[model samples]
Target: GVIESNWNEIVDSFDDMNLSESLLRGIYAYGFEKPSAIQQRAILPCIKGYDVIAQAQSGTGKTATFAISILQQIELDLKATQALVLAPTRELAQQIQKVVMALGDYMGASCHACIGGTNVRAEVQKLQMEAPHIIVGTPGRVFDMLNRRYLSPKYIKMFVLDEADEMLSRGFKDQIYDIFQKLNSNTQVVLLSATMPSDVLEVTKKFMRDPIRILVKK
Candidate 1:
C-alpha cells in the first residue's frame, strides 16, 4: 500500500522504511508519483553510501534525486558540516540550494551558499556560528573558503559535483582538484552532469572510487 502510494516498489520486499507524511506531501508536490530510472538505480547505492556518477540529461528528476540523497544522509544531530555541493554558476548554486532547502524543510537542516559576487563575510559568519549540513557553491568560492581555512573537509561526508562538465569547461579543474584533495577518504562522491565528456571522465577516474554510472536517456 505504501509502495503504491509512493510509487516506489518494494523490490526485495525487504526494505521497510516508513516515509513521513510531510515528506510524502513534498514528493507529491514535486509530482514524483513514481521513481525515475535514475532514482531507482541510485537510491539504494547512495543510501548505502557509495560513490555515484549519474549521467542524466536535464529535466529527468536528477536534481530531485540529488537533493533527496543528500537530505537522507544529513546528520541533524551532529551539527557539523556533512555535505558539499559544487555548482558551476552562482545561479545554479542558488537554485540547487533552494531545492535542497525545500526538500529539507521538515529537517530544519542548515545550508549555506558560497559563490562569487556575494557577501563573503556574511557567509564566513554563517560558517563560524552555525555549521551547515550542506554547503552549495561555485568552485572558486568553495576553494576560496578552503584556502582561507574557513571550510574544513574532515566533517564532509557527502560531496556532490553538480554540472561537472560545465565546471570543467569553466576552467575550475584546479579549484576542484584542490577541494578534492582536502576531502576525507570516507566521504561519498557524487557527480551530476548532463554531459559526460572525455575530460570529465578522466577527472572522474582520478577522483571517484568504484563509482556506479547511471544514464537516463530521454
Candidate 2:
C-alpha cells in the first residue's frame, strides 16, 4: 500500500548520490550533466532499496532514473539474471536494453532482450552461453523463458515495470503476476508511467512493499 511518508530530498547532481564512479562515468558519457527532476528525486530512494512508483510525463528521463539505480544495486552475477525489466512492447524492451547497457558500460554489465516473435531455441542457446546480468523484454517472452528454466529468478533482486499503466492493464496483468510469483520476496519493485489511474495504482500495491510515491507534476 502507498505510504504518506516524507519524500526524500532531491539531489542536485548525480555525483552527490551513493553511486560508484563507474556509474557516474556512464551517466556523464550519456550526455547528462545534471539529473532530471525525476532522476534527481527517484534515484537516491531507489538505490536505498525502496519500492518506488514514479509518475512522470513522457521524455522526462524516467528510464535513466531506474536504469542507473538498477545498475548500482545489481550484484552482476553472470550465472543468473539479477535484474528483470518488463515492458509492454518489444521496441520498448529493446530501447531499455540499450539504455541500461549505455549506463552500465563502465561497470562491464551485460544485458539481453527477450522479446517475442524471436526464435526461442536461439535465445535459449544465448542464455546458456552467456546469461545476462539484466534481462529486458516483453512479459510473454520473459514468462516463457522462466517457465522453460532458461531464465532463473534465483538471483533476481530487482523487478521494473515500464509503462506501468499499460503493463498492469488487462492485456498483461496475469503474465506480470505469473512472473512476480517466481521472484524472491525481497526483490525491489519499481513502476514507471506517464499516467497512472487509481485502479492500476491499487493493483501495483498488491505486489509492492510499502512503496514510496514520487509524482512529478508538469
Candidate 3:
C-alpha cells in the first residue's frame, strides 16, 4: 500500500514551522509534492524532538522518511557531528548517505560515510577538515571511530537505527548498544524498519523514551 498524506497538510506544517526557503526547495527537488504516510506522521514529531520508530518497508519511500528529520534538525552553523545513522550493511550505509546528501543538497550539509572495506584514514581526515553534521556507517566502523576518538557523541542530536531488527540478527547488537549508551541524554532516537520483532521492542524500550510508533503495514 502507498503511504498517503495530503499536500495541504505538509504546506500548513511548513508554514507553521516557518521552514526556510532552501528546505522547501530541497523537499520539492526531491520530488516530494506531499508527505508520505510515514512523513506525515513522523516529521512533525521529529521536529518536535520526539523519539520515533517507524515501521515501513523498502520502496515505501522510507529513506526520505528519516532523511526529512535529519535535514530539518541539522544546524548548518554547527561544525560538529549532530546526526548518526546506523545501517546494517555497508551497501545500505552508502545508499543512505547518498540519499541524505541529495535531500540536503541546497543546505550544503557535510555528510560522511564510514563503512567497512573503505579507507579509514580518509574518513578520519574528513573529520579533521570539516566535521560532518550527519554520519552514516555500519556498526563496526562507527564503533572504531568512537574508539579512535574521532567520532564524538557529545553533540549528537539524533541517533537512527535503520534496519534495527536486521542489525540485531546480524550480531551487531553489542556495538549498537554501546553507541547508544554513549549518546547524550537529549538525543532523539529513531528506529526505522520494515518490521519490529519482540527483540526490537526490547531494545527500543531500553534506549528510547516515550517514542511515537508509526506502523505502515501493507
Candidate 4:
C-alpha cells in the first residue's frame, strides 16, 4: 500500500489525473467539458485497480466514471474480454455499451453488448470472430454466454455492475453471482449505487476486495 493511493482522492478536471492522451481526447470529444462529481472522485481509483463502490446519479454523468477507468485500464492488444459491465436490463446495458464505445472510439477500443432480445448466433459470430476488449451486457444473457462457454472469463480484469440495487431486487442476483464466480479472484470490481445500502452490501461483501467506498458519491 506504499504506492500513492487515490482511494480518497478527487480531481478538479479530467486532465487533472495521469490519463492517457487518447482517453483525454476521447473525453473532450464526447462533449465532456469538465469532470462531474463521480468522475472527479471515482475514475482514478478504478484505473489504479482499486475495487470501488460509488453513489451515482444522472446529473453527474455516472457511467463515465467507470467507462473512463475501463478504457484506461484496458489492454487493447490482448484481444480478450478484460472488462465486463453488467446492468439489470437490456436498455441500460445498451446505454452503457454506447458510452463505453463513444469514449473508446478514439482509442479504437472494441466492445460488445451481450444483452438479450437479439440473435445469439450474431453474438456468437461477433464474439468469436472479433473478441471485444470490453463487454457490457445484461446479467442473464451474460450468464448464458458464460454457461455455453462462449465467453472466457480467464482473462477478465475488471467487473462493473450498474444499478446493482435493482439487479438484486429485480432478481438477477443469481445470474450476477454466476457471472461473478468466473472472474479472477483479484479482478477489480466497481459498483454504482444510486440508492441502496443492503443491496450493495449483498454484492460487495460477496464479490469485492477492500473496496474504496465513496459515501458521498455523485
Instruction: Return the top candidate by lDDT.
Output: 2
Candidate 2 clashing pairs, residues 3+ apart or interchain: none
Per-residue lDDT over 95-186 for candidate 2, one digit per residue giving the tens place of the 0 to 100 score: 99999999999999998999857575676789989788999988988999999898989999899999878776638888888999999988
Stretches of candidate 3 off by over 4 Å are 1-18
Pairs clashing in candidate 4? none
Question: Per-model C-alpha lDDT, please?
Answer: 0.77, 0.86, 0.80, 0.83
Clashing residue pairs in candidate 3 are none
Which 10 residues in a row give candidate 4 its minimum summed lDDT? Answer: 1-10
Kindly list the per-residue Cα lDDT of model 4 for residues 102-211, writing each as its tens digit: 99888989889997565767877888786789998888889998888888998898999888877887899889888888878879899886776675676888998777
- TM per prediction: 0.87, 0.93, 0.90, 0.93
Q: Name the runs in model 1 displaced over 4 angstroms.
A: 1-25, 29-31
Task: Report the alpha-carbon TM-score of model 4 versus the true structure.
Answer: 0.93
Worst 10 residues of 3 by lDDT: 1-10
lDDT tens per residue, model 3, 33-87: 7666666666777777888777888887778768877888888998999999999
How does model 3 score by TM-score?
0.90
Best-to-worst order by lDDT is: 2, 4, 3, 1
